[PDB]
Amino acid sequence: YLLMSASITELLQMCWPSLSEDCVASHTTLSQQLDQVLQSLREALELPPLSSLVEQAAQKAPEAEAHPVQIQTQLLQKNLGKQTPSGSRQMDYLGTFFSYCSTLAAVLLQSLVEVKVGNPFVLLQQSSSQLVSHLLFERQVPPERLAALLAQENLSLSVPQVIVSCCCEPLALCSSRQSQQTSSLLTRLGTLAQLHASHCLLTSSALAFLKSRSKLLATVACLGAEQVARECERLLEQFPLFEAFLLAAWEPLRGGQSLAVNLCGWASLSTVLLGLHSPIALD
Amino acid sequence: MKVANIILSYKCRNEDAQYSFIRESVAEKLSKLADGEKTTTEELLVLLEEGTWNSIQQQEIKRLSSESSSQWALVVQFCRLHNMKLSISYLRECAKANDWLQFIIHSQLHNYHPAEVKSLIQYFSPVIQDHLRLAFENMTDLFEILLQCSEEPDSWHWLLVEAVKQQAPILSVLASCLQGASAISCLCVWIITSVEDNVATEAMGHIQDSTEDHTWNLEDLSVIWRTLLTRQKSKTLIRGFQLFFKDSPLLLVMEMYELCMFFRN
């Protein structure tokens, strides 16, 4: 078999699994098939994100059925199994990662009947948050249908957490830069105290979903134009005990106007919610 | 046999010594491995990896092509054969280089246990990293800690348990604003999580249960109150009792304590 494939101590010290009748040529064929596949794989897959997917979805269904990537995809998906152990539960990794670049493509295309899911390894070009951001803001999509669809696939993009951290604020809550900054403030203010006492002698429509879920994560979202101030007015009016730690925290830093028309828009409103827990607290 | 043979290159073409002393040393190490010396086994496999890398380089090919894995199979082969933990050999070597269609395949055809692939996933990139951690799944940001606070029993304990741990105090006020939080509870959280370290700690002695199983009542405030007043620090209580339960008389009973024993008018 060795000679034919090519077409003692030479062999009995190599390291194929067992010297049984079939295993030698079996492994030879398996390895050769996997290589001949993966080579053409990388070759094809080496070949706008949303735009590209849109274009690939505009062809004829018989044409899409012959996607070269898809063409070899099942080939490899089966070669891995046919070349692998038996009796042990092989976790189908290739399947799991194929599902996430298939189903997400389907949802992000449908929300844009049926859809010809073309080359699916085109949306791995940009990260997760970017895609949802582009679809949500750019191409006039309503921020409720998307959060609806992503529910019926068991995913976790968090259609709120992708709209908040793209147009609202960098609010951060550390825990170790507090006790390492009290000992700095106590010194800087002391140095500024002695040397001065010794002188002794469109504007968003996602407010729909935002207010729809957990109004608190709409109040804090607002505090980060005049219409925004107007929304903050009422949405904090419905809350009694929050505008006490925003007025016993606004006087000893700046002082007219109103209790919200002053904060919501200024760097006076991002060192005040949090205490010393900020990079720009000291100044 | 294959292991000892492959160990030649980066022990002979890298070290200058008579091959016979090397042979004696290798035989001693081999008998040691036969004794099941796990540490020695680990060292031997480590050297195997090093020499294997040298040999791979020698052939003058890409360090992570197909034939690369073809030669690399023995790496898994040895570790499994000797009942040693599957070493993360080329998974990382492809992880740093941002090549997914090697971390999929070569993850697969040796049965890489599901802990390791995810654990080593954190080497790739900004992109093709979030599309992967969530790919097969199956905080420090107030817009997130509260967004993912619509998931608990109701709310009144996830926020408090998260805010007692890290010393913060602009979370408890939101906590006592959602439907169903004991207004006479969140005060313990504020006054215990807006003081210094030793004060916040030595007052906790009254507790018996763990952090997430200590529902506060109208009794823990007693020891909190006493501990705070002892070792003078009152401009904190005289300050909380205004956000929380209002002008009700205890506020004045403590407000006397600023005009006396501090301010003296």
XYZ file of C-alpha atoms in Angstrom:
548
model
C 0.000 0.000 0.000
C 2.852 2.369 0.774
C 4.454 1.617 -2.588
C 1.178 1.997 -4.495
C 0.393 5.307 -2.805
C 3.911 6.434 -3.654
C 3.105 5.419 -7.223
C 10.537 -2.382 6.657
C 12.620 -0.427 9.020
C 11.559 2.027 6.357
C 8.088 1.810 7.878
C 7.702 -0.073 11.166
C 8.884 3.072 12.970
C 6.572 5.671 11.393
C 3.592 6.955 13.338
C 0.290 6.315 11.640
C -2.337 5.199 14.173
C -2.183 1.436 13.649
C -0.647 -0.816 11.016
C -4.056 -2.318 10.208
C -5.056 -3.001 6.622
C -7.067 0.127 5.889
C -5.990 2.844 8.305
C -2.875 3.775 6.328
C -4.578 4.656 3.047
C -7.625 5.880 4.967
C -5.572 8.544 6.725
C -3.658 9.350 3.556
C -6.891 10.015 1.690
C -8.400 11.945 4.596
C -5.406 14.227 4.999
C -5.092 14.788 1.268
C -8.806 15.605 0.987
C -8.737 18.044 3.916
C -5.729 19.819 2.446
C -7.110 19.945 -1.097
C -10.290 21.413 0.358
C -8.859 23.967 2.789
C -6.476 25.244 0.128
C -9.325 26.121 -2.232
C -11.210 27.309 0.855
C -8.711 29.985 1.803
C -8.353 30.725 -1.908
C -12.051 31.502 -2.282
C -12.576 33.156 1.112
C -9.621 35.485 0.544
C -11.841 37.243 -2.012
C -19.078 47.895 2.503
C -20.353 45.079 4.752
C -24.055 45.764 4.435
C -23.700 46.944 0.853
C -21.835 43.797 -0.157
C -24.405 41.542 1.497
C -27.195 43.511 -0.200
C -25.592 43.033 -3.604
C -24.980 39.335 -2.984
C -28.671 39.075 -2.090
C -29.771 40.523 -5.444
C -28.838 37.558 -7.670
C -30.839 34.529 -8.823
C -31.527 31.726 -6.361
C -29.946 28.984 -8.532
C -26.819 31.131 -8.774
C -26.765 31.625 -5.003
C -27.124 27.874 -4.494
C -23.666 27.516 -6.078
C -21.810 29.865 -3.742
C -18.212 28.608 -3.905
C -17.808 29.165 -0.175
C -21.023 27.258 0.465
C -19.933 24.753 -2.182
C -16.879 23.695 -0.217
C -18.495 24.378 3.159
C -20.427 21.130 3.395
C -17.451 19.309 1.879
C -15.202 20.309 4.768
C -18.015 20.048 7.300
C -18.262 16.386 6.382
C -14.551 15.733 5.911
C -13.864 16.793 9.495
C -16.330 14.222 10.763
C -15.245 11.450 8.436
C -11.597 12.010 9.438
C -12.198 12.190 13.181
C -12.541 9.753 16.067
C -15.599 7.590 16.657
C -17.522 7.009 19.874
C -16.451 10.320 21.424
C -18.781 13.338 21.322
C -17.128 15.655 18.808
C -18.305 19.189 19.602
C -19.248 20.593 16.201
C -17.318 23.838 16.411
C -17.483 24.507 12.711
C -21.249 24.238 12.901
C -21.522 26.586 15.861
C -19.481 29.254 14.171
C -21.285 28.736 10.882
C -24.628 29.293 12.575
C -23.586 32.633 14.052
C -22.405 33.995 10.703
C -25.501 32.600 9.016
C -28.354 33.517 11.363
C -27.040 36.989 12.100
C -26.690 37.631 8.390
C -30.249 36.465 7.886
C -31.660 38.708 10.612
C -29.654 41.789 9.687
C -30.770 41.262 6.088
C -34.462 40.565 6.710
C -34.890 43.540 9.020
C -33.415 45.714 6.272
C -40.560 37.020 2.217
C -37.191 35.253 2.181
C -33.560 36.150 1.541
C -30.804 34.506 -0.489
C -28.045 34.230 2.125
C -24.989 34.602 -0.099
C -21.346 34.633 0.961
C -21.881 34.834 4.729
C -18.230 35.431 5.655
C -18.510 39.035 4.563
C -20.000 40.416 7.787
C -17.049 39.258 9.866
C -15.290 42.310 8.437
C -16.525 44.658 11.155
C -17.234 44.084 14.825
C -20.649 43.454 16.345
C -21.601 46.870 17.684
C -20.673 48.580 14.440
C -23.201 46.675 12.346
C -26.148 47.305 14.647
C -25.097 50.938 14.861
C -24.991 51.320 11.095
C -28.361 49.673 10.609
C -29.988 51.555 13.490
C -28.906 55.060 12.661
C -28.016 55.177 8.976
C -30.662 53.400 6.911
C -33.763 54.646 8.744
C -34.716 51.557 10.727
C -37.070 51.698 13.735
C -35.402 50.554 16.945
C -38.131 48.095 17.836
C -38.350 45.623 14.963
C -34.650 44.799 15.294
C -34.850 44.203 19.030
C -37.879 42.065 18.250
C -36.182 39.853 15.681
C -32.963 39.320 17.615
C -35.156 37.859 20.338
C -36.223 34.957 18.126
C -32.752 33.655 17.507
C -31.346 33.361 21.075
C -28.662 36.055 20.723
C -27.403 38.857 22.957
C -26.544 41.952 20.904
C -28.576 44.024 23.406
C -30.191 46.525 21.029
C -30.232 49.016 23.941
C -26.548 48.631 24.846
C -25.581 49.332 21.234
C -27.634 52.520 20.981
C -26.529 53.921 24.322
C -22.754 53.666 23.789
C -22.729 55.196 20.336
C -24.375 58.573 20.896
C -24.644 59.188 24.657
C -21.631 59.127 26.964
C -18.487 57.477 28.364
C -19.702 56.999 31.948
C -17.242 54.789 33.814
C -17.223 53.262 37.281
C -13.880 52.014 38.570
C -13.151 51.080 42.164
C -9.402 51.391 42.690
C -8.866 54.913 41.399
C -10.874 56.237 44.349
C -8.640 55.363 47.293
C -5.646 56.268 45.119
C -7.171 59.698 44.425
C -8.425 60.679 47.870
C -4.782 60.768 48.953
C -4.063 62.993 45.950
C -6.944 65.418 46.407
C -6.174 65.785 50.112
C -2.731 66.966 49.082
C -3.500 69.159 46.099
C -6.223 71.058 47.921
C -3.943 71.434 50.931
C -1.244 72.953 48.736
C -3.869 75.277 47.270
C -5.135 76.032 50.791
C -1.941 76.988 52.613
C -0.600 79.181 49.811
C -3.869 81.106 49.970
C -4.647 81.196 53.686
C -1.104 82.236 54.629
C -2.179 85.462 52.968
C -3.554 86.117 56.463
C -1.678 89.386 56.974
C -31.771 65.473 14.000
C -31.795 64.819 17.745
C -32.535 61.069 17.926
C -35.819 59.160 17.805
C -34.624 56.085 19.731
C -36.157 57.763 22.752
C -39.078 55.506 21.852
C -37.335 52.254 22.771
C -35.304 53.997 25.447
C -38.365 55.145 27.348
C -40.053 51.854 26.499
C -37.593 49.853 28.589
C -36.660 50.796 32.142
C -37.229 54.562 32.298
C -34.219 54.957 34.620
C -31.942 54.017 31.726
C -33.645 56.846 29.894
C -33.108 59.486 32.561
C -29.412 58.656 32.901
C -29.247 58.421 29.113
C -30.561 61.961 28.755
C -28.036 63.245 31.306
C -25.179 62.661 28.895
C -30.759 70.091 22.647
C -33.438 72.156 24.329
C -35.717 69.257 23.400
C -33.384 66.958 25.334
C -33.660 69.299 28.292
C -37.440 69.228 27.956
C -37.503 65.424 28.022
C -35.238 65.359 31.064
C -37.576 67.781 32.799
C -40.590 65.488 32.894
C -38.680 62.211 33.089
C -37.004 63.435 36.255
C -40.197 65.048 37.474
C -41.624 61.568 37.875
C -38.747 60.777 40.281
C -38.607 62.278 43.774
C -35.419 61.082 45.455
C -33.003 61.429 42.547
C -33.178 65.200 42.297
C -31.833 65.533 45.774
C -28.493 63.948 44.976
C -28.371 66.113 41.982
C -29.009 69.414 43.802
C -26.974 68.614 46.923
C -24.280 67.868 44.358
C -24.709 70.829 41.975
C -24.414 73.677 44.463
C -20.883 73.107 45.793
C -19.437 73.055 42.328
C -21.037 75.933 40.374
C -23.583 77.811 42.503
C -30.107 80.429 37.777
C -31.766 78.634 34.826
C -33.180 75.247 35.983
C -31.990 72.112 37.782
C -31.646 70.224 34.500
C -31.136 72.861 31.793
C -27.667 73.433 33.274
C -26.293 69.891 33.615
C -27.532 67.880 30.655
C -24.892 68.825 28.143
C -21.896 69.990 30.176
C -18.803 68.509 31.805
C -20.386 69.661 34.983
C -22.709 66.629 34.489
C -20.158 63.816 34.312
C -18.058 64.538 37.398
C -21.184 65.037 39.523
C -23.142 61.780 39.245
C -20.058 59.811 40.129
C -17.846 61.111 42.885
C -14.061 60.871 42.757
C -14.531 57.901 40.391
C -13.584 59.680 37.223
C -10.459 60.278 35.155
C -11.196 64.001 34.993
C -12.438 64.389 38.553
C -9.416 66.219 39.949
C -9.279 69.209 37.622
C 10.748 6.629 19.587
C 9.296 9.524 17.612
C 9.620 11.871 20.589
C 13.250 11.030 21.282
C 14.095 11.254 17.584
C 12.424 14.627 17.102
C 14.211 15.898 20.223
C 17.504 15.633 18.332
C 17.591 18.922 16.409
C 17.287 21.465 19.227
C 19.579 19.450 21.450
C 22.376 18.721 18.949
C 22.254 21.417 16.252
C 21.822 23.956 19.077
C 24.053 22.596 21.871
C 27.737 21.657 21.550
C 28.452 18.353 23.288
C 29.440 14.788 22.542
C 26.381 12.888 21.370
C 27.039 10.052 23.847
C 26.682 12.188 26.965
C 23.497 13.589 25.442
C 22.359 10.011 24.886
C 23.035 9.094 28.508
C 21.181 12.181 29.727
C 18.233 11.431 27.453
C 18.112 7.823 28.638
C 18.113 8.961 32.263
C 15.293 11.392 31.525
C 13.439 8.640 29.665
C 13.615 6.245 32.591
C 12.484 9.143 34.766
C 9.454 9.643 32.523
C 8.760 5.907 32.724
C 8.413 6.499 36.463
C 5.539 8.842 35.618
C 7.399 12.017 36.601
C 4.716 14.545 35.722
C 7.050 17.514 36.129
C 9.725 15.815 34.052
C 7.027 14.874 31.576
C 6.068 18.537 31.292
C 9.685 19.560 30.763
C 10.153 16.898 28.092
C 7.030 17.995 26.238
C 8.120 21.619 26.528
C 11.426 20.797 24.889
C 9.494 18.821 22.292
C 7.521 21.929 21.442
C 10.661 24.047 21.249
C 12.539 21.658 18.994
C 9.420 21.130 16.931
C 9.255 24.860 16.339
C 12.896 24.879 15.312
C 12.328 22.006 12.893
C 9.242 23.652 11.435
C 11.287 26.779 10.803
C 14.040 24.718 9.200
C 11.805 23.338 6.449
C 11.427 26.945 5.264
C 7.634 27.196 5.132
C 4.945 29.323 6.740
C 4.969 28.582 10.455
C 1.208 27.876 10.353
C 0.328 26.339 6.969
C -1.364 22.969 6.357
C 1.751 20.799 6.383
C 2.573 22.706 9.541
C -0.312 21.038 11.338
C 0.590 17.841 9.523
C 3.936 17.748 11.303
C 2.358 19.218 14.435
C -0.047 16.349 14.966
C 2.587 14.573 17.020
C 2.340 17.448 19.499
C -1.148 16.402 20.493
C -0.277 12.767 19.957
C 2.354 12.702 22.677
C 0.433 14.723 25.255
C -2.652 12.556 24.953
C -0.642 9.349 24.797
C 1.019 10.153 28.122
C -2.177 11.360 29.830
C -1.006 14.967 30.121
C -3.133 18.101 29.762
C -3.566 19.018 26.114
C -1.023 21.791 25.651
C -2.060 24.925 23.799
C 0.531 24.650 21.049
C -0.550 26.197 17.736
C -3.963 27.513 18.741
C -2.235 30.584 20.180
C 0.321 30.734 17.383
C -2.635 31.238 15.062
C -4.531 33.333 17.595
C -2.052 36.199 17.578
C -2.019 36.274 13.775
C -5.765 36.794 13.223
C -6.515 33.651 11.183
C -9.927 32.255 12.183
C -10.047 29.423 9.693
C -7.333 27.820 11.605
C -8.750 28.324 15.110
C -11.915 26.681 13.869
C -10.540 23.639 12.046
C -7.502 22.838 14.120
C -9.612 23.456 17.160
C -11.937 20.792 15.858
C -9.999 17.815 14.625
C -8.440 16.962 17.896
C -11.446 17.646 20.172
C -10.200 20.784 21.887
C -12.095 20.830 25.177
C -14.557 23.732 25.247
C -12.893 25.589 28.110
C -9.592 26.066 26.312
C -10.854 27.519 23.030
C -12.910 30.225 24.721
C -10.189 30.901 27.288
C -7.583 31.454 24.586
C -10.039 33.392 22.413
C -8.886 36.611 24.087
C -5.851 37.161 21.859
C -7.221 38.058 18.445
C -8.235 41.624 17.816
C -10.864 44.307 18.383
C -12.804 43.009 15.384
C -13.314 39.238 14.857
C -13.377 39.031 18.630
C -16.883 40.178 19.515
C -18.162 38.172 16.535
C -16.526 35.172 18.173
C -17.070 35.417 21.912
C -20.780 35.574 21.228
C -20.335 33.194 18.282
C -20.544 30.187 20.561
C -21.452 31.509 23.944
C -23.658 28.412 24.246
C -19.508 45.270 34.421
C -18.039 48.792 34.699
C -20.412 51.208 32.950
C -23.525 52.754 34.462
C -25.326 52.556 31.155
C -24.661 48.803 31.386
C -24.997 47.947 35.075
C -28.528 49.325 34.971
C -29.413 48.142 31.469
C -28.627 44.591 32.603
C -30.461 45.214 35.870
C -33.790 44.387 34.238
C -33.144 40.668 34.765
C -32.945 39.899 38.510
C -35.759 38.694 40.792
C -37.118 42.201 40.552
C -34.271 44.656 40.986
C -33.874 45.459 44.624
C -30.945 43.208 45.196
C -28.771 42.927 42.102
C -27.950 46.642 42.121
C -27.327 46.705 45.859
C -25.196 43.558 45.820
C -23.162 44.991 42.952
C -22.793 48.385 44.609
C -21.816 47.244 48.088
C -18.874 45.310 46.650
C -17.271 48.120 44.683
C -17.381 51.277 46.766
C -19.826 53.476 44.851
C -22.746 55.672 45.905
C -24.569 56.951 42.840
C -26.123 53.522 42.321
C -27.962 53.165 45.614
C -30.000 56.275 44.885
C -31.221 54.766 41.629
C -31.752 51.511 43.498
C -34.226 53.165 45.846
C -36.224 54.515 42.924
C -37.413 51.370 41.115
C -40.780 49.829 41.995
C -40.229 47.730 45.114
C -37.208 48.804 47.152
C -37.421 49.216 50.922
C -36.777 52.911 51.450
C -35.499 52.181 54.956
C -33.029 49.700 53.497
C -31.015 51.529 50.832
C -29.903 53.921 53.581
C -27.700 51.213 55.025
C -26.144 50.724 51.595
C -25.450 54.422 51.068
C -24.081 55.141 54.543
C -21.946 51.976 54.465
C -20.659 52.559 50.930
C -19.803 56.241 51.167
C -17.191 56.323 53.944
C -13.530 55.415 54.345
C -12.183 51.873 54.235
C -11.687 51.076 57.921
C -14.985 52.751 58.795
C -16.804 50.750 56.131
C -15.170 47.522 57.323
C -15.192 47.605 61.125
C -18.876 48.494 61.047
C -19.685 45.323 59.115
C -19.025 43.101 62.143
C -22.729 43.072 62.986
C -23.429 40.956 59.890
C -23.594 37.157 60.083
C -24.591 35.869 56.631
C -22.807 36.458 53.333
C -22.945 39.526 51.100
C -25.884 38.538 48.890
C -27.942 37.006 51.723
C -28.105 39.821 54.290
C -31.434 41.561 53.788
C -31.147 44.759 55.815
C -33.765 45.762 58.359
C -34.454 48.432 60.966
C -31.753 46.889 63.154
C -28.512 47.074 61.170
C -28.913 50.867 60.949
C -28.511 50.858 64.729
C -24.972 49.523 64.686
C -24.214 51.640 61.592
C -25.424 54.772 63.402
C -23.442 53.990 66.539
C -20.261 53.115 64.684
C -20.427 56.272 62.584
C -21.037 58.600 65.525
C -18.273 57.009 67.532
C -14.985 58.160 66.033
C -16.479 61.489 64.966
C -17.969 61.494 61.477
C -21.429 63.066 61.419
C -21.553 65.190 58.296
C -22.353 61.965 56.499
C -25.478 60.961 58.417
C -26.650 64.568 58.731
C -26.336 64.410 54.962
C -27.952 61.106 54.036
C -31.076 61.641 56.090
C -32.052 64.295 53.505
C -31.960 62.214 50.350
C -33.640 59.422 52.289
C -36.376 59.612 54.947
C -36.903 63.364 55.270
C -37.419 66.003 57.963
C -38.939 63.389 60.314
C -37.569 64.282 63.731
C -34.430 62.113 63.923
C -32.904 64.573 61.458
C -33.183 67.408 63.964
C -32.153 65.176 66.852
C -28.896 64.770 64.909
C -28.858 68.337 63.574
C -28.326 69.551 67.101
C -25.074 67.595 66.953
C -23.536 69.862 64.356
C -24.292 73.135 66.137
C -22.942 71.462 69.262
C -19.680 69.548 69.678
C -18.623 70.746 66.238
C -19.743 74.285 65.493
C -20.471 75.783 68.932
C -23.134 78.493 68.652
